Amino acid sequence: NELKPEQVEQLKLIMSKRYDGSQQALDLKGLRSDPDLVAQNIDVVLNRRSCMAATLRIIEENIPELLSLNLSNNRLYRLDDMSSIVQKAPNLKILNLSGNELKSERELDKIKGLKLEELWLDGNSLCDTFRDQSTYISAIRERFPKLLRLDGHELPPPIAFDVEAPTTLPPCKGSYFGTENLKSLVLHFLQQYYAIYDSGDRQGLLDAYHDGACCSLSIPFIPPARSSLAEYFKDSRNVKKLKDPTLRFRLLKHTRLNVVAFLNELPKTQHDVNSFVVDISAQTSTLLCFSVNGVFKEVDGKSRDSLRAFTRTFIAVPASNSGLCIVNDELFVRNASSEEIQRAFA
Amino acid sequence: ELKPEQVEQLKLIMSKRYDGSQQALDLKGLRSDPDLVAQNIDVVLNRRSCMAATLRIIEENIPELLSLNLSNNRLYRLDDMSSIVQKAPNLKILNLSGNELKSERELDKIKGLKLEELWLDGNSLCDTFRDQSTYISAIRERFPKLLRLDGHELPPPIAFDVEAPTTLPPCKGSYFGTENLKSLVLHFLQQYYAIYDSGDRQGLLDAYHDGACCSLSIPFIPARSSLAEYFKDSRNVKKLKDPTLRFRLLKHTRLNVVAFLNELPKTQHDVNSFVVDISAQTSTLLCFSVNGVFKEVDGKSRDSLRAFTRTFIAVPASNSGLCIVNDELFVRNASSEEIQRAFA
Amino acid sequence: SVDFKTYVDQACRAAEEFVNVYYTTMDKRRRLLSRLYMGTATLVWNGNAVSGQESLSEFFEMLPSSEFQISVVDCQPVHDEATPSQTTVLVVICGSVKFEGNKQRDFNQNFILTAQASPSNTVWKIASDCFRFQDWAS
Amino acid sequence: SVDFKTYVDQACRAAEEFVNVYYTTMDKRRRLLSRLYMGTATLVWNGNAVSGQESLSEFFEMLPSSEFQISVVDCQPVHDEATPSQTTVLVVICGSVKFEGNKQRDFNQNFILTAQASPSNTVWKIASDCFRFQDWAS
C-alpha cells in the first residue's frame, strides 16, 4: 500500500547513497532488492504509481541537476506513470530501461518530451519483435531525434538542418541628433515650444508655425466607454478606420490660425522636457524632420490626474534668427505604461 | 447596316480627318460632317452598329494611332465601344467631351486601355462631384496612369516599385572548371559509354568500386508508356514510403550493379551531344552530372529516343582513372527540340 | 493650379497603399524592402542611424523575420517650401510587431514619401524612416 | 560499426527532410537559403559556377522569387572512402519550377550532403549543388 512518511526519508537516504556526485548518476537498479530497504522491511515497488511518483518528487526536490538515471530490472509494464519525468528532471540526458517487461515501442511516446543523448532498451521483450536494426533505430529515433547512443552503440548522425535564422535585435539607443548643432537647435526649440505649450495660453505658438502649417492628432484604437482618451477621442484621425474623404479633410487643420485655434482647445499640459527622447529622421537644406517621444500630465478637469504618453512628429523649414518653422505637426497620444509612469519625474 | 460603299466613304472621311504627324483621329460631330451629309450618309456613333463598324475600321486600317477624339457625338452608353481596348491598344489619348454620359460608372467598361490624357469636360457626370478631389480620385480609379485630365495636369500618380527581379541568368552548356577535369571526365565518359553501348556490359566491372551503389528513376506520371519498362525498376523515395522495399531497388555491390545494368535494354548514346557538369571536386572524391540522349535497339522501346540525366561520384584511380562509388540514372522521353537535334 | 483637398485625398490613398506595400514586403520579401528607400534616405531604428542603400539592405537582412499588425495610420501632405517642385507626403503608423525569437511589441513609426518622376514612369521613394518601440527601455 | 540498410534508411529520411527544408526556404525566405551551403561548396546553375558563401548569397539574391513543385526524388548513401570519417549522402530531385516572369520549366537537380558534428550540436550542410533545366536550349 502507501508508504509511511518515515520510510520516505529512509528511501531518500538510500537514493542519496545510490547517487554519485562526480558523474551525476542516480542508480535505481533493482531498488526492491536493495539491502537497506529490505533490512528496514520497507517494500518499494517502482512499477506502482505511488512509489514512482514519490521517487520523481524526491528527484525534483533533492537533485534537479542530475544528467543520468538507471531504472533497469524494475519490471515496469507501463511507462506513463513516469511521464512527468520531463519536468522533474529536465537536465536528464541519459536513461536506462534495460531488463523490463514492456513489449512495445508505443510506451515511449509518453517519454518523448525529454531529450536524451544516450538510451538503453536492451533486454526488453520489445527488441525481439523487430527484424532489422534499421527499423529499431528509426522507431526509436522518431521519439528521440537527438540521441547519439543506443544500447551502447553509437548511432548515425542525427538528422538536422540549420537554417540559421537571426534572433538578435539591434542595440537600442536613447536619442539621435546627428551633429551637435541639431542637438542644441532642436532641444532649444523644444524648450521654447513646450515652455509656451505648457503655459496655458498657447497663442505664443503662432510665431513657431508656418502660414500653411498642417497639424493632426491620433490615438491607439480602443475596442467609447468614457476611457481616459475620451477627450482626445473627438479629434483623432485614422485613415485606416475612416474612409470618408470630406471628414478626413477637416480632421486635418490647414492653416496656422485653425491649428492654434484647435490647439487651444486641447487640455492644459505638463511635459517632462528632460525625459524627452528625440530622433532626427532626416535633414536637408530645405527641411528638417524629427520625432519626440515622452509623457505628459494634464492640469485641468477630472481627467487631469491621469498621465499620458505621447509621440510627436515635426517637420521644420528654417526661419530667421536661427529659429525653425514647423510646416507639419503630428501628435500620437496614449495612456502611459506603468514603467513610464514610475519614471515619470526625477 | 450601312452599304460597303458608305463604309468606304466613311473610311475616306476618317482618312481625311486623320493626321499623320500627330497620329490623331478626329471624329468630332461625325453626323454633322459636311461630306457624309452631302453623300447622304448618316452615321450615329451612339448606335451600337455604326460604332462597331467605325471601331472595326479603326482596327483594319490604322492600328498605330495614339490619339482619338469622340466629342459632341451624344453617346449615352460606353459599353458598345468597350472593345476599343482590343481595336486600339496603343491609344494613349481619349476625348469624350460634350457628350451625354450621365454617370462615372460608364468608364468601368473602358478601364482596360491606358491613357496619359483624358477629357470628360461638358458631360452630365461632372455635375455630381462636390470637389475636384472626388472627381480626380473617381476618374483615377479607372485610369490610375493618366497624367492629364481635362487639359489640367494632375498630381503624380501613386505607384510603388518593389523592384522584384524577373530575369534569369543566361544558360550555359557545360562546366568542367579546370580543363584537366574536362579531358579526364570526357575520356572517362568515352570509355564508359563505349563499354556501355557494346551489349556485353561485363566490361564495366573494372570501372565501379567494390561497395558501389546504383539506382534508377523516371518522371512521375499509366500503362504501356515508353518508360513503363523502367517503371518496374525506378526508385522514388517520395512516392514509396516503405523502407524494406526501398532497400531492394538499391544495388549495394558492383556485382548487383552490373548484373542490374545487364538487365537494362541495349543502348546507343550520342556522346558528342553530352552535356557535363562538375558539381564538386575534392582530393577524396569528384562528382559530375551527365545530361544527354540515347536510343535503344531491342524490344518495344526499339526505334524510340530517350533523354537522360546521370550523376556520378568518383574516387580517383591510378593513371587518371576514376572509380565510381555512387551512380544515379534518371530516364525520360526526349523533347521534340531534342529529337530534332538528336544526332549529327 | 491644383486644389488643396486633392493633395489630402491623394496623400491618404498614397499612405494606405504604401502601408500595404512596405509592410507586406517587409514581412514576405525582406530582401526587396530595401529597394523602396532612395539612396539619400536615412533610417533611425531605435536611435541607430542607417544611411545609404547598402547599409539599409544589410541592416534589413540582419533583422529577424517579422509579422506586423497595424492598429492605426495617419497621413499629411507636406508644404512645397520644404521640397520645392517635388510632391511629398508624411505618414505615421502605430501598430504591433513580432520579431523572430523576440516577444511582441507595440511600435510607432513615421515615413516621409517623395514622388520621383522619370520620363517612362513615376514612382515614390522613402526619403526618411524613424522606427521606435513604445517600451524600448525594457 | 553500423549496418548498411540503416545508412540507406537514414539517407531516405535525410532526403525527405532536406527537400522540404531547402525548397520551402528557397520559396518563402530566399535570404536564409545560403546558410545551408558550406563555404567550400560549389554550385553549378545551368553551367554557371558559384563558389563561396558570399557569391552564393548574392547569386541567390539576384534570382527571381520561386515556386518549386517537386515531381520525384531519389537518394543514396555515399562510400566512406569519398569522405573519410564523415557521414554523407547523395540526393537527386526532378520537378517543375515557376520563376517570376518566366514560364514554368521542368528541372533536374542533385545535391551532396555532408554531416557536420560540433560538440554542442550536429548539423548537415550541402557540399555541392548542380541545377539544370530539362530545356536549357531555349
CATH number, domain of D119, equals 3.10.450.50
* Distance in angstroms (rounded) separating the CA atoms of residues A5 and B237: 58
- Cβ atoms of B332 and B218 closer than 8 Å: yes
The CA-atom distances, in angstroms, between A196 and each of A191, A206, A270, A288, B330 are 9, 10, 11, 21, 80
- Residue B132 contacts C where some CB pair is shorter than 8 Å: yes
Distance of CA B37 to the CA centre of its chain: 51
* Chain A partners within 8 Å of B137 (Cβ): 245
Domains of chain B, each with CATH number or no CATH? 1-164 (3.80.10.10), 165-344 (3.10.450.50)
* Distance in angstroms (rounded) separating the CA atoms of residues B135 and A218: 28
What is the rounded radius of gyration, in angstroms, for the C-alpha atoms of chain D?
15
- Residue A340 contacts C where some CB pair is shorter than 8 Å: yes
| Beta-bridge mates of residue B68 | B25, B94
**At C10, which amino acid appears?**
Q
What is the rounded radius of gyration, in angstroms, for the C-alpha atoms of chain C?
15
What are the phi and psi torsion angles at C3 (to 5°)? -65, 160
Ramachandran area for residue A137 (φ above 0: left; ψ -120 to 50: alpha; else beta): alpha
* Chain C partners within 8 Å of B131 (Cβ): 3, 5-6
Q: Which chains touch B (3 or more CB pairs under 8 A)?
A: A, C, D
* Distance in angstroms (rounded) separating the CA atoms of residues A250 and B314: 77
Nearest neighbour of B157 by CB, restricted to C5, C32, C122 = C122
* Distance in angstroms (rounded) separating the CA atoms of residues B132 and B150: 12
* Distance in angstroms (rounded) separating the CA atoms of residues B258 and C51: 63
What are the phi and psi torsion angles at A258 (to 5°)? -65, -35
Burial of B114 (C-beta count, 10 Å sphere; 0-12/13-18/19+): middle
A298 Cβ neighbours under 8 A, 6+ residues apart: A267, A268, A269, A270, A304, A306, A308
* Chain B partners within 8 Å of A245 (Cβ): 133-134, 137
Which of A170, D49, B128 lies closest to C47 in space, CA to CA? A170
What is the rounded radius of gyration, in angstroms, for the C-alpha atoms of chain A?
36
Grouping H, G, I as helix, E, B as strand and the rest as coil, residue B266 is coil
- Cβ atoms of D70 and D93 closer than 8 Å: yes
Please give the grid coordinates belonging to residue A97.
530501461
Dihedral sign from CA coordinates of B271, B277, B282, B286: negative
Ramachandran area for residue B237 (φ above 0: left; ψ -120 to 50: alpha; else beta): alpha
* Distance in angstroms (rounded) separating the CA atoms of residues A175 and A186: 12
Please give the grid coordinates belonging to residue A263.
490647439
Q: Do residue A245 and residue B130 have CB atoms under 8 angstroms apart? A: no
Helices A5-18, A49-62: axis angle to 10 degrees equals: 60
Interface test with B, best of A243, A246, A250, A254 (most B CBs within 10 A): A246
Nearest neighbour of A156 by CB, restricted to D10, D21, D123 = D10
Q: Do residue A238 and residue C65 have CB atoms under 8 angstroms apart? A: no
* Distance in angstroms (rounded) separating the CA atoms of residues A279 and A257: 28
Q: Do residue A163 and residue D124 have CB atoms under 8 angstroms apart? A: no
Please give the grid coordinates belonging to residue B275.
552535356
Please give the grid coordinates belonging to residue B182.
574536362
- The end-to-end CA distance of chain C, in Å, is 51
* Chain D partners within 8 Å of A154 (Cβ): 1-2
Nearest residue of chain D to residue C32 (CA atoms): D61
* Chain D partners within 8 Å of A163 (Cβ): 21, 25, 29, 32, 35-36
Which residue spans within chain D are E strands per DSSP?
37-45, 48-51, 66-77, 88-99, 105-117, 122-133
- Cβ atoms of D114 and D125 closer than 8 Å: yes
| Residue corresponding to grid cell 548574392 | D58
Which of B106, B6, B113, B105 lies closest to B50 in space, CA to CA? B6
Which of D119, B3, D13, B330 lies closest to A137 in space, CA to CA? D13
Grouping H, G, I as helix, E, B as strand and the rest as coil, residue B150 is coil
- Cβ atoms of C100 and C26 closer than 8 Å: no
Q: Do residue B158 and residue C13 have CB atoms under 8 angstroms apart? A: yes
Grouping H, G, I as helix, E, B as strand and the rest as coil, residue A140 is helix
Helix H segments across A89-200?
A: 133-143, 180-199
B3 Cβ neighbours under 8 A, 6+ residues apart: none
Largest Cα separation within chain A, whole Å, is 100
Distance of CA D88 to the CA centre of its chain: 13
* Distance in angstroms (rounded) separating the CA atoms of residues A26 and A19: 4
* Distance in angstroms (rounded) separating the CA atoms of residues B316 and B319: 9
Please give the grid coordinates belonging to residue B218.
523516371
- Residue C58 contacts D where some CB pair is shorter than 8 Å: no
Grouping H, G, I as helix, E, B as strand and the rest as coil, residue D30 is helix
Interface test with D, best of C29, C58, C67 (most D CBs within 10 A): C29
**Three-state SS sequence of chain C:** CCCHHHHHHHHHHHHHHHHHHHHHHHHHCHHHHHHHEEEEEEEEECCEEEECHHHHHHHHHHCCCECCEEEEEEEEECCCCCCCCCCEEEEEEEEEECECCCCCEEEEEEEEEEEEECCCCEEEEEEEEEEEECCCCC
* Chain A partners within 8 Å of B134 (Cβ): 245
- Cβ atoms of A229 and A335 closer than 8 Å: yes
Ramachandran area for residue C20 (φ above 0: left; ψ -120 to 50: alpha; else beta): alpha
Q: Which domain holds residue D97?
A: 1-138
Grouping H, G, I as helix, E, B as strand and the rest as coil, residue A265 is helix
* Distance in angstroms (rounded) separating the CA atoms of residues D33 and A115: 28
Nearest neighbour of C62 by CB, restricted to A166, A178, A239 = A166
* Chain A partners within 8 Å of B129 (Cβ): none
| Residue corresponding to grid cell 512596405 | C22
Q: Which chains touch D (3 or more CB pairs under 8 A)?
A: A, B, C
* Distance in angstroms (rounded) separating the CA atoms of residues A327 and A208: 9
D76 Cβ neighbours under 8 A, 6+ residues apart: B213, B215, B250, B326, B328, D8, D11, D89, D90
Question: What is the dihedral angle through the alpha carbons of C3, C6, C11, C12, rounded to the nearest 10 degrees?
Answer: 150
**How many degrees, rounded to 5, is the angle at CA B115 between CA B109 and CA B117?**
120
- Cβ atoms of A330 and A303 closer than 8 Å: no
CB atoms within 10 A of CB A228: 16
* Chain D partners within 8 Å of C65 (Cβ): 29
Which of A49, A47, A53, A43 lies closest to A14 in space, CA to CA? A43
| Beta-bridge mates of residue A314 | A290, A329
Burial of A3 (C-beta count, 10 Å sphere; 0-12/13-18/19+): middle
- Residue A167 contacts D where some CB pair is shorter than 8 Å: no
- Cβ atoms of B128 and C2 closer than 8 Å: no
Q: Do residue B326 and residue D79 have CB atoms under 8 angstroms apart? A: yes
| Residue corresponding to grid cell 520489445 | A126
- Cβ atoms of A308 and A337 closer than 8 Å: no
CB atoms within 10 A of CB A64: 12
Please give the grid coordinates belonging to residue C123.
514612382
- Cβ atoms of A198 and A270 closer than 8 Å: yes
- Cβ atoms of A140 and A124 closer than 8 Å: no
**How many degrees, rounded to 5, is the angle at CA A259 between CA A256 and CA A264?**
125
* Chain C partners within 8 Å of D31 (Cβ): 30-31, 61
* Chain D partners within 8 Å of A158 (Cβ): 122
DSSP A213: E
Please give the grid coordinates belonging to residue A18.
545510490
* Distance in angstroms (rounded) separating the CA atoms of residues B244 and D12: 12
CB atoms within 10 A of CB B217: 26
* Distance in angstroms (rounded) separating the CA atoms of residues A10 and A16: 10
**Number of domains forming the structure of chain C:** 1
Interface test with C, best of A249, A254, A313 (most C CBs within 10 A): A313
* Distance in angstroms (rounded) separating the CA atoms of residues A63 and A60: 6
- Residue C61 contacts D where some CB pair is shorter than 8 Å: yes
CB atoms within 10 A of CB A17: 11
The helix (H) or strand (E) run that includes residue B326 is strand B322-333
- Cβ atoms of A43 and A69 closer than 8 Å: no
Grouping H, G, I as helix, E, B as strand and the rest as coil, residue A271 is strand
* Distance in angstroms (rounded) separating the CA atoms of residues C116 and C136: 34
* Distance in angstroms (rounded) separating the CA atoms of residues B67 and B117: 9
Nearest neighbour of A245 by CB, restricted to C9, C71, C90 = C9
Ramachandran area for residue B100 (φ above 0: left; ψ -120 to 50: alpha; else beta): alpha
* Distance in angstroms (rounded) separating the CA atoms of residues C12 and C22: 15
Grouping H, G, I as helix, E, B as strand and the rest as coil, residue A183 is helix
| Residue corresponding to grid cell 490613398 | C13
- Residue D27 contacts C where some CB pair is shorter than 8 Å: no
Distance of CA C80 to the CA centre of its chain: 20
Please give the grid coordinates belonging to residue C95.
501598430
Nearest neighbour of A174 by CB, restricted to C47, C78, C82 = C47
| Beta-bridge mates of residue B175 | B277
- Cβ atoms of B83 and B107 closer than 8 Å: no
A254 Cβ neighbours under 8 A, 6+ residues apart: A212, A214, C4
Which of A110, A206, A119 lies closest to A155 in space, CA to CA? A119
Nearest residue of chain D to residue A164 (CA atoms): D35
Interface test with C, best of B150, B162, B163, B166 (most C CBs within 10 A): B162
Which residue spans within chain A are E strands per DSSP?
19-20, 25-27, 68-70, 94-96, 118-120, 149-150, 153-154, 209-218, 269-271, 277-283, 288-298, 307-318, 324-335
- Residue D61 contacts C where some CB pair is shorter than 8 Å: yes
- Cβ atoms of C76 and A216 closer than 8 Å: yes
- Cβ atoms of A296 and A310 closer than 8 Å: yes
What are the phi and psi torsion angles at B68 (to 5°)? -140, 155
Which of D70, D76, D72, D86 lies closest to D12 in space, CA to CA? D76
Please give the grid coordinates belonging to residue A138.
528509426
CB atoms within 10 A of CB B105: 12
Burial of C7 (C-beta count, 10 Å sphere; 0-12/13-18/19+): buried
Nearest neighbour of A134 by CB, restricted to D5, D32, D123 = D5
Q: Do residue D29 and residue C65 have CB atoms under 8 angstroms apart? A: yes
| Beta-bridge mates of residue A283 | A288
- Cβ atoms of A29 and A70 closer than 8 Å: yes
* Chain C partners within 8 Å of B152 (Cβ): 1-2
* Distance in angstroms (rounded) separating the CA atoms of residues D14 and D111: 12
Which of A316, C37, B181 lies closest to D44 in space, CA to CA? B181
Q: Do residue B130 and residue A246 have CB atoms under 8 angstroms apart? A: yes
* Distance in angstroms (rounded) separating the CA atoms of residues B166 and D101: 5
Interface test with B, best of D18, D130, D138 (most B CBs within 10 A): D130
* Distance in angstroms (rounded) separating the CA atoms of residues A35 and C132: 67
* Chain B partners within 8 Å of C24 (Cβ): none
Please give the grid coordinates belonging to residue A261.
485655434
* Distance in angstroms (rounded) separating the CA atoms of residues D10 and D90: 11
CB atoms within 10 A of CB A56: 18
CB atoms within 10 A of CB A33: 10
DSSP A174: S
Taken as a whole, chain B contains a residue count of 344
- Cβ atoms of C43 and A178 closer than 8 Å: no
- Cβ atoms of B311 and D78 closer than 8 Å: no
| Residue corresponding to grid cell 542637438 | A183
